[PDB]
Structure formats: structure tokens, C-alpha cells
Amino acid sequence: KHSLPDLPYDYGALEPHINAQIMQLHHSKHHAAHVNNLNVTEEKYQEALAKGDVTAQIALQPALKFNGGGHINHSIFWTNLSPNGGGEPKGELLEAIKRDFGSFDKFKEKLTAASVGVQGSGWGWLGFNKERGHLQIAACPNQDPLQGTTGLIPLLGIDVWEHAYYLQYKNVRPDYLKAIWNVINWENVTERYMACKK
Amino acid sequence: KHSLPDLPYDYGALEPHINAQIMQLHHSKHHAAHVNNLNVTEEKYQEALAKGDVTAQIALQPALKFNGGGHINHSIFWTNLSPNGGGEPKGELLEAIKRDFGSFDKFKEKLTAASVGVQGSGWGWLGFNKERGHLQIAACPNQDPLQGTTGLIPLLGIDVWEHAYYLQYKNVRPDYLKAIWNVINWENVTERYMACKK
Amino acid sequence: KHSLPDLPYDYGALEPHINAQIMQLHHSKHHAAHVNNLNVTEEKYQEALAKGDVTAQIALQPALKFNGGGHINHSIFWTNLSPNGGGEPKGELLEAIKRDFGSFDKFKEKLTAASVGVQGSGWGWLGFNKERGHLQIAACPNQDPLQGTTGLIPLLGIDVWEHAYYLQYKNVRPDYLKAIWNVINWENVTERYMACKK
Amino acid sequence: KHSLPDLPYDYGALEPHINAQIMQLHHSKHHAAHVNNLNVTEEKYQEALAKGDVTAQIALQPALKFNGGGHINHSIFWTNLSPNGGGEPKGELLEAIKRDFGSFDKFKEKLTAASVGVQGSGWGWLGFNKERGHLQIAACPNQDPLQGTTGLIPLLGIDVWEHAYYLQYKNVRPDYLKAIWNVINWENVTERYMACKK
Numbered sequence: 135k136h137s138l139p140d141l142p143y144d145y146g147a148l149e150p151h152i153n154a155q156i157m158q159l160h161h162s163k164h165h166a167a168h169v170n171n172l173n174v175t176e177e178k179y180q181e182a183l184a185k186g187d188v189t190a191q192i193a194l195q196p197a198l199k200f201n202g203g204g205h206i207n208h209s210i211f212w213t214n215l216s217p218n219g220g221g222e223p224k225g226e227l228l229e230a231i232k233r234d235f236g237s238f239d240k241f242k243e244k245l246t247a248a249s250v251g252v253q254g255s256g257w258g259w260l261g262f263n264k265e266r267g268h269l270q271i272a273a274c275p276n277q278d279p280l281q282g283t284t285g286l287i288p289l290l291g292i293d294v295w296e297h298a299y300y301l302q303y304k305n306v307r308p309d310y311l312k313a314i315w316n317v318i319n320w321e322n323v324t325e326r327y328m329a330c331k332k
Numbered sequence: 333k334h335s336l337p338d339l340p341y342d343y344g345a346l347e348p349h350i351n352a353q354i355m356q357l358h359h360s361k362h363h364a365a366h367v368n369n370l371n372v373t374e375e376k377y378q379e380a381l382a383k384g385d386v387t388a389q390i391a392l393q394p395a396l397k398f399n400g401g402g403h404i405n406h407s408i409f410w411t412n413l414s415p416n417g418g419g420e421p422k423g424e425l426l427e428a429i430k431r432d433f434g435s436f437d438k439f440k441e442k443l444t445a446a447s448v449g450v451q452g453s454g455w456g457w458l459g460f461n462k463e464r465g466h467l468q469i470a471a472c473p474n475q476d477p478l479q480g481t482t483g484l485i486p487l488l489g490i491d492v493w494e495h496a497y498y499l500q501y502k503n504v505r506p507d508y509l510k511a512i513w514n515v516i517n518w519e520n521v522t523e524r525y526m527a528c529k530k
Numbered sequence: 531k532h533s534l535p536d537l538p539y540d541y542g543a544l545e546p547h548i549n550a551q552i553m554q555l556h557h558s559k560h561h562a563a564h565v566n567n568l569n570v571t572e573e574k575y576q577e578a579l580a581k582g583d584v585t586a587q588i589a590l591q592p593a594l595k596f597n598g599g600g601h602i603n604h605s606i607f608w609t610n611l612s613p614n615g616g617g618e619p620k621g622e623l624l625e626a627i628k629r630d631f632g633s634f635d636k637f638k639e640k641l642t643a644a645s646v647g648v649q650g651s652g653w654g655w656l657g658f659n660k661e662r663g664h665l666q667i668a669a670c671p672n673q674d675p676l677q678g679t680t681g682l683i684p685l686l687g688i689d690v691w692e693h694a695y696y697l698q699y700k701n702v703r704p705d706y707l708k709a710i711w712n713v714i715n716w717e718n719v720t721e722r723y724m725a726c727k728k
Numbered sequence: 729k730h731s732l733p734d735l736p737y738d739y740g741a742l743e744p745h746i747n748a749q750i751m752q753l754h755h756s757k758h759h760a761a762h763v764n765n766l767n768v769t770e771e772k773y774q775e776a777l778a779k780g781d782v783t784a785q786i787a788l789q790p791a792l793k794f795n796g797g798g799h800i801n802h803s804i805f806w807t808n809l810s811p812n813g814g815g816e817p818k819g820e821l822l823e824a825i826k827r828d829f830g831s832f833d834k835f836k837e838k839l840t841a842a843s844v845g846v847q848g849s850g851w852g853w854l855g856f857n858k859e860r861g862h863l864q865i866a867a868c869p870n871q872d873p874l875q876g877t878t879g880l881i882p883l884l885g886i887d888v889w890e891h892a893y894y895l896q897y898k899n900v901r902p903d904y905l906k907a908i909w910n911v912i913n914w915e916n917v918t919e920r921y922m923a924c925k926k
């Protein structure tokens with residue numbers, strides 16, 4: 135049974151970068167719905183699987199990927215942010231960024247571009263390519279999860295669905311991108327990165 | 333050269349169903365952006381086409397469909413709404429609705445379902461299948477335009493991108509859908525339908 | 531579990547419309563591989579579901595849809611053909627074909643077009659739309675199954691993957707489509723169609 | 729106006745790795761049809777563009793990408809092969825492969841996996857990522873061209889559509905992949921790679 139995880143901070147902890155109304159709706163409504171729907175879908179898949187009903191398993195894929203992915207994505211997203219975040223990472227993660235993108239600032243331009251480049255709903259990601267052994271930027275549509283659809287280990291995700299920023303920045307997604315850099319929990323991203331050094 | 337058409341009414345003409353801030357942003361920003369992006373992309377295609385640069389033509393497709401589609405969809409959308417709208421259509425359109433969907437209410441349930449069913453950004457459409465000579469409902473992702481991607485002639489469209497309802501209804505897309513029926517310009521939908529019968 | 535069904539005829543029973551080597555490979559190798567891969571994938575999904583591993587479920591979707599779809603599609607296809615086939619259906623099925631497509635010949639022109647119109651691998655289908663209560667022609671990419679991805683009930687399928695015809699007709703898919711009508715099992719298609727009106 | 733490029737060798741020049749029947753059909757029929765379809769589509773697109781018909785432009789995208797990509801892909805493919813090729817590439821290309829994939833053998837395994845991994849019709853590619861300045865392996869569906877859809881510069885392509893191997897290898901695609909390494913034109917692959925060093 136999946137559950138809506140608790141945020142590591144209060145709804146207004148990311149102000150003024152991401153306002154309180156967005157955090158509350160995003161978490162209590164959007165993420166919550168993904169969780170509730172995911173549980174129903176999984177139960178239905180178990181029933182279809184037990185019956186060897188292939189058509190039913192196939193028909194359930196859209197809801198499983200969408201809500202299952204949404205659960206994966208938002209859960210990671212909350213840990214990627216912090217009221218004590220911002221600045222730049224340090225140590226091995228910082229060195230990997232320089233090595234793979236030239237500089238931290240160049241990395242920001244790249245992740246920003248991937249995030250701004252999404253037409254429609256989606257996510258921008260900084261990931262780790264296990265076979266190439268280096269960092270890699272990628273964009274995902276709707277709620278398609280990074281690992282489940284590309285194989286890359288997610289380290290940092292940026293939600294660019296309109297509900298992630300509209301109330302505060304309206305149509306100007308770029309302003310939202312410039313703002314979010316102020317609340318990134320580089321400690322969490324670093325931990326996720328080191329988990330790859332397994 | 334494509335141009336941003338003026339709305340058929342003022343920004344606040346659709347209150348309280350779709351508020352003034354939504355109408356103004358939707359038209360002055362989202363649609364406005366599609367129009368220029370479309371014109372720039374077409375001029376770019378003209379140059380690639382002239383040079384027989386196939387890679388260039390292919391790389392421009394996402395922008396052309398997204399903004400070209402954005403222009404087509406929103407242009408139809410404004411005409412589909414009216415401060416004097418609402419109610420039910422009459423004549424041949426209504427009879428086709430009864431014939432193809434059973435009743436006006438059943439049709440409403442079906443278009444609402446298709447619209448509510450869009451995962452991510454998209455549109456819900458009531459269209460006309462010229463091949464079969466009857467009505468047909470369909471959903472399109474992002475800005476993919478109905479006729480250009482399915483062959484169906486657009487009669488009535490419902491924008492379900494979060495920017496079309498979020499500032500007012502937040503995450504409750506179903507409440508937006510319920511509200512929009514109050515401003516449907518059935519005169520315009522009937523016109524588009526009869527034109528398929530020219 | 532799932533197992534490879536036996537053909538309702540010998541591998542060379544559809545000559546000279548579809549030669550023996552194609553029937554043999556298509557059934558004993560292609561469909562066979564789909565079954566074996568399906569069983570393995572279902573087992574993997576059962577494990578991922580039990581552990582609540584959503585990423586694993588997502589990652590397995592491509593293999594599940596492709597091989598599960600492959601098993602579904604080929605199983606129907608074998609029953610849709612017969613050495614004692616060809617001609618035209620009768621009774622209610624023919625009645626619906628005339629009503630929904632104008633005539634049997636127009637129907638053939640339409641399904642033929644949808645089949646030849648597949649760019650890449652896929653299938654052409656004559657299905658039944660339960661909601662609208664009438665026939666509907668649709669095309670599906672790769673092994674995506676008709677009902678699982680469109681909701682339409684499959685009645686007659688035309689495999690347009692190159693392995694369904696290349697050994698005999700090479701690149702000329704139209705020649706293959708022209709020939710297959712000589713072996714369509716209208717008894718089976720009528721049976722499927724009657725099962726829908728229940 | 730686009731034209732079918734002559735092969736750099738005779739149809740039976742790649743025996744016994746890729747027989748003469750496949751080479752003749754692949755070039756004179758498959759590639760040839762893409763060229764014709766491309767010219768016809770480009771012309772129709774020019775007509776639509778001139779009249780500002782956005783719907784017409786969108787409707788033509790599938791045929792343009794499919795046949796334009798087809799022309800791009802096969803044109804590169806022909807130059808990627810040679811009766812005097814095979815073995816390992818000489819010069820910097822090999823050092824780059826060692827750097828980015830560990831060794832030549834590892835490189836072959838990955839490109840083979842990416843090629844065998846295509847479900848349905850498609851291509852396997854060894855490309856060059858200009859932004860990251862290193863080699864990168866990717867797979868593309870149907871005829872979607874590498875540079876046009878991913879931005880990666882094509883260096884070596886492996887056609888895995890069934891028409892590229894079925895007449896000779898039937899369903900055993902892995903045997904086709906094994907055999908193709910014997911005719912790789914590393915001179916051309918290096919030529920394409922050096923053009924990326926700029």
C-alpha cells in the first residue's frame with residue numbers, strides 16, 4: 135500500500151521562491167491523487183494478472199505509468215528542495231558537474247533549457263548514467279518517470295507542469311526556473327549521487 | 333503571415349464561468365506566443381525547404397505542430413465561447429447529437445469524460461467525421477490540432493491545459509468543465525457543423 | 531498460464547495467397563517468442579507488484595504490451611484466416627458493413643488503405659465500437675493490441691509487419707493485401723461480431 | 729529535387745554478410761520509394777506553406793518525417809558499408825570508442841543490444857554528441873532520423889527493419905547483426921567523426 139509522504143518542511147517553508155498555496159495544492163491535491171489512484175490501479179492489476187487477462191493489463195498501463203510515475207516524481211521532488219537549500223553543491227558532486235558540464239553555471243543553463251524546452255506537461259532531470267558512469271540531463275513528458283523510462287538514476291528533478299508554478303509566475307516559466315535554484319537541497323542530491331557510487 | 337485574432341468579446345465577458353485574468357493571459361500571452369512562434373517557424377521552414385535541407389525540416393516539426401496547432405486550437409476556442417452562450421443547440425446539430433450520442437446529456441457526459449481523461453496537457457473535441465458522415469469525440473495531446481492529426485473537422489473544443497482553468501478552479505478540472513457548458517457558443521458550433529454539410 | 535495455440539489448419543493450407551514458410555515462421559517463431567516472453571514478463575510483474583516497486587512495473591510495460599499484444603494479435607489472426615475462406619460475409623455482419631461503410635467493396639478499400647497506410651510495423655483492424663454500437667476501422671502500431679489500447683472489440687485483423695509478407699511479396703505490401711482477402715474466414719469474423727451484439 | 733544516390737559498390741559486393749537480393753531490393757525499391765515520396769511531400773508542403781494552410785502542413789508531417797528520414801537514413805547506411813571494411817577502425821575513432829565504451833568489444837555489444845532492442849521497425853546508431861563532445865549510442869523508431877529528432881550526429885547506422893535482413897536471416901535478427909560487423913566502412917565512419925571535431 136502506497137502512502138502520500140510527509141513533506142520535510144512546512145507548506146510555506148520555500149517562500150518566497152515557491153509560495154505556500156502552490157506547495158499545499160501540489161502536495162495535498164496533486165500528489166495525493168496520484169497515490170490514491172495508484173493504489174486502485176495496482177489492486178486492479180493484481181486481479182488482471184491473476185486471471186491472465188492480458189487486455190486488462192495493457193489497458194491499465196496508462197493509469198499505472200501516470201499515477202505511479204507521479205508518485206515517484208513528486209516523492210523525489212519534495213526531497214530535492216529545502217528551506218535551507220540554495221547555493222552550489224560541493225565535493226564529488228560539484229566535481230562531477232564541472233567534469234560533465236564544464237561548470238556549475240553551464241550545468242544550470244543546460245538543466246534550465248531542458249526544463250524550459252518541455253512543450254506541454256513534464257519534468258527536467260539531472261540524472262546519472264550507470265553504464266557511461268557520468269551525469270546526464272534529460273526531459274520527461276507528463277509523469278513518465280526518469281528511471282522507469284530511461285534507466286537513468288534521478289538526482290534532481292524540476293517539475294514544469296503548469297500547476298507547479300502558474301499561480302505565482304503565471305505563463306513565465308523561466309522566472310520559476312530562476313527562482314527554484316534558491317531552494318535546491320544539494321545535500322539530498324549529493325546523497326542520491328553517492329548512492330550511485332555503489 | 334498569421335495574426336492574433338481579437339476575441340469576440342471582452343476579457344471579462346465570460347464571468348463567472350471563466351474569469352477575466354484567465355481570458356487575458358490565455359489570449360495575450362499563450363495564444364500570442366503561438367502566433368509569433370508559428371510565423372518564425374514557417375519562415376525557417378521556407379529556407380530549409382529552399383535548400384532541400386531535410387534534417388532541418390524534421391527538426392522544425394515539433395515547433396510547427398505545437399505553435400501551429402496552438403494557433404488553430406485557440407482560434408477555434410474563442411469562437412466556441414460567448415457571453416450569450418450556454419443552453420442547448422437546435423436543429424440538425426441537436427438531432428445529430430441525439431443520433432450519435434443518444435441525447436444531449438449523454439453527449440455532455442462523453443465530452444466531459446474525454447476532457448477530464450486527458451493526462452497532462454491537451455484538448456477535448458467534438459468533431460465531424462466526413463468519411464462516416466457523423467459526429468465523433470476525441471482528445472488530443474498538447475497542441476496537436478484535431479483536423480491535422482486525426483482528419484476530424486473541429487466543431488467544439490475544450491482546452492484542458494492547466495493554464496485554461498488553474499487560477500480559478502485550481503486542481504478541480506471537473507468544476508471547470510461543469511462551468512464551461514454555461515458559455516458554449518452553440519450558434520458557432522452549429523455553423524461549423526453545417527459547413528461540413530455544405 | 532499462456533501457451534502457443536495451434537493453427538486451425540496446416541502451414542501450407544493458405545497457399546498460394548500466403549506461402550508455407552511464412553506461416554511456419556510466423557507461428558512457430560514469431561508468435562512463439564511472444565508467448566515465451568509474455569510468461570516471463572508476467573512473472574516479473576507479479577514480483578514487482580508484490581514488492582510495490584513502481585519503477586520496475588513501469589520498466590516492464592514495453593515488454594508486456596509488445597509481447598502480450600503480440601500474443602493477443604496473432605491468436606486472433608490465425609482464426610481470421612482459413613483455406614476455405616474468401617468471398618463475402620452475409621446476414622447481419624454484411625448488413626452492418628453496408629450501413630457503416632456503404633458497401634462491402636468500400637469496406638475493403640478502407641481496411642486496405644488503413645493497412646497499407648501503416649508506416650513501420652503494425653496492424654490494420656476492423657473492430658466494433660460498443661459505445662457507438664457500430665463497426666470501426668483502426669490501425670495499431672507494432673504489437674499494440676486493439677482492445678487494450680483503443681477499447682474497440684477486434685473482429686478482423688491484418689498483420690502488416692514485413693514478416694507477414696516479405697518472403698513472398700517482398701516490398702509490395704499492396705499485393706499481399708489484395709491476396710489476403712481470398713483467405714479471410716468470414717465465419718470466424720461473423721462469430722466475433724455476433725458476440726458483440728449480446 | 730532529391731535523387732536516389734548510386735551505391736558505392738555493386739549489389740553483391742557485401743556477400744555473404746548481406747546478400748545481393750536484399751541489397752538490390754533495399755536500394756532500388758525501399759530507398760527509391762522514400763525519395764519519390766519525399767519529393768512529392770516536399771512539394772505539397774511548399775504549396776501549403778505558401779497559402780498559410782497550417783492544418784495541411786501538420787497533416788503532411790508523418791509522410792515528411794518518414795520519407796525524409798528514410799532518405800537520410802539509407803543514404804548514410806550505404807556509405808557506412810564496404811566490401812573492404814570490417815575489423816576494427818584505425819586512428820582516433822578507435823581511441824574514442826575505447827574512451828567512451830571501455831573497449832571495442834564493449835562498444836559492439838552495446839550497439840548490438842541497442843539494435844536488437846528495437847521492438848518493431850527502426851535503427852541503431854553510434855552518434856556524436858556535440859554538446860558533451862563524446863560518442864553516444866541511440867536507437868530510433870521507424871525512419872525517424874538521428875540528427876533531426878535527437879540532435880546527435882550520425883556516425884554509424886544499423887538498419888533493423890525486417891526488410892534489411894529477413895530474406896536472408898529470417899527472424900534471427902541477432903545473426904544479421906553479427907554478420908554486419910564484417911562490412912563496416914570505418915573510413916566513412918571516421919570521415920563523419922572527424923567532421924564533428926570542429
Ligand SMILES: [Mn+2]
Nearest residue numbers: 164293295298
Ligand atoms: Mn507536479
Ligand SMILES: [Mn+2]
Nearest residue numbers: 362491493496
Ligand atoms: Mn490554452
Ligand SMILES: [Mn+2]
Nearest residue numbers: 560689691694
Ligand atoms: Mn506478425
Ligand SMILES: [Mn+2]
Nearest residue numbers: 758887889892
Ligand atoms: Mn531500410
